[PDB]
Enzyme design. Structure first.
Site, short mmCIF file in Angstrom:
data_model
loop_
_atom_site.label_atom_id
_atom_site.label_comp_id
_atom_site.label_asym_id
_atom_site.label_seq_id
_atom_site.Cartn_x
_atom_site.Cartn_y
_atom_site.Cartn_z
N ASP A 172 5.18 -5.45 1.03
CA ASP A 172 4.84 -4.18 0.37
C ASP A 172 4.15 -4.42 -0.97
O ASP A 172 4.82 -4.68 -1.98
CB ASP A 172 6.11 -3.35 0.18
CG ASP A 172 5.84 -1.98 -0.46
OD1 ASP A 172 4.67 -1.57 -0.56
OD2 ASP A 172 6.83 -1.33 -0.85
N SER A 179 -12.28 2.61 -6.59
CA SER A 179 -13.32 2.62 -5.58
C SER A 179 -14.54 3.34 -6.12
O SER A 179 -14.42 4.23 -6.93
CB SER A 179 -12.82 3.28 -4.27
OG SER A 179 -13.90 3.60 -3.42
#
Length: 330
Positions: free
Chosen positions: A35, A199
């Site tokens: 994770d 992004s």
């Protein structure tokens, strides 16, 4: 040193991925959920409330000659999906794909919430976010990666998740045969303890690319792709009959649809998520309404590049002094 382990989807929807981890002496092998969005290594154990165990493999520290109770230490964690666990702490020897850490904090669950109990295929989590998020008290503990770093040939690990197929977590090296083209690296903020990056935009299907900064985290521990409501609306508007359903808890679409791809920007580069990756099947057995793999992050408070996005890429988690993230197509 290096390590290399195969990671496997737990079910036909790729709801999560499990990776075998050897704990203790002799080895006890548990299948953990790696994770990159948390920083506790915790396991079902001999100490877990018996009623809360249903099929998981448990860690028994009394059977490990290298296990030591970390006196006084406790842990308690809550995840973004509302699940939780808590317990006490041992240190022990932990090996992943040939790579060994001695004195790793192994957090032993006394209590787990129902969603963990109901997940018979996941024996625990192995956190790979930054150690600042570790919940051990009163002495915070380091992640497996942080403990291993100094011994690693290169201070990196990589995630290469499969679509309906096995993949690979590598530690300490970059497998140049596992991706196509070049790796594009992008800056990371550790300020919230996550692999947080920005992004450079997105496209829907064959649509033109929209240049726009999208701050989010690379999180192998989250199934879906959570993005701003504007982006997500733009995506689902291209699927006939798709709608946001409050009763179901997100965007659904007719199972008869063909989904468009979704592209996200990494600097000047592009990662394309095939439309198939975004199909998470019937909302309930037998239903003709299917659940979408791109969902709104509104009300999470952060955008999440979960497995839907990450499995479309070869992802480098660079833990150098100045951490960065790298993405390549594959």
């Amino acid at each position: 040193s290096t390590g290399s382990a195969t990671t496997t989807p737990i079910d036909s929807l790729d709801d999560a991925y499990i990776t075998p981890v050897q704990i203790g002496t002799p080895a006890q092998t548990l299948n953990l959920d790696f994770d990159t969005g948390s920083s506790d290594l915790w396991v079902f154990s001999s100490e877990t409330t018996a009623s809360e165990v249903d099929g998981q493999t448990i860690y028994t520290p009394s059977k490990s000659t290298t296990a030591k109770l970390l006196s006084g230490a406790t842990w308690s964690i809550s995840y973004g999906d509302g699940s939780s666990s808590s317990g006490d702490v041992y240190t022990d020897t932990v090996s992943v794909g040939g790579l060994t850490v001695t004195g790793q904090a192994v957090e032993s669950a006394k209590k787990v919430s129902s969603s963990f109990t109901e997940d018979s295929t996941i024996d625990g989590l192995l956190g790979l976010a930054f150690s600042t998020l570790n919940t051990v008290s009163p002495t915070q503990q380091k992640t497996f990666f942080d403990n291993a770093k100094a011994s690693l040939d290169s201070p990196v690990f990589t995630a290469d998740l499969g679509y309906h197929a096995p993949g690979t977590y590598n530690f300490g090296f970059i497998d140049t045969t596992a991706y196509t083209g070049s790796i594009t690296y992008t800056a990371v903020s550790t300020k919230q303890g996550f692999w947080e990056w920005t992004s450079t935009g997105y496209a829907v299907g064959s649509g033109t690319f929209k240049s726009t900064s999208i701050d989010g985290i690379a999180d192998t521990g989250t199934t879906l792709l959570y993005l701003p409501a504007t982006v997500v609306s733009a995506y689902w508007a291209q699927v006939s009959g798709a709608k946001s359903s409050s009763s179901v808890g997100g965007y659904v679409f007719p199972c008869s649809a063909t989904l468009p791809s979704f592209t996200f920007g990494v600097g000047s580069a592009r990662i394309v998520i095939p439309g198939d990756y975004i199909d998470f099947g019937p909302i309930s057995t037998g239903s003709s309404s299917c659940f979408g793999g791109i969902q709104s992050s509104a009300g999470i408070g952060i955008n999440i590049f979960g497995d839907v996005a990450l499995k479309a890429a070869f992802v480098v988690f660079n833990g150098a002094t100045t951490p960065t993230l790298g993405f390549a197509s594959k």
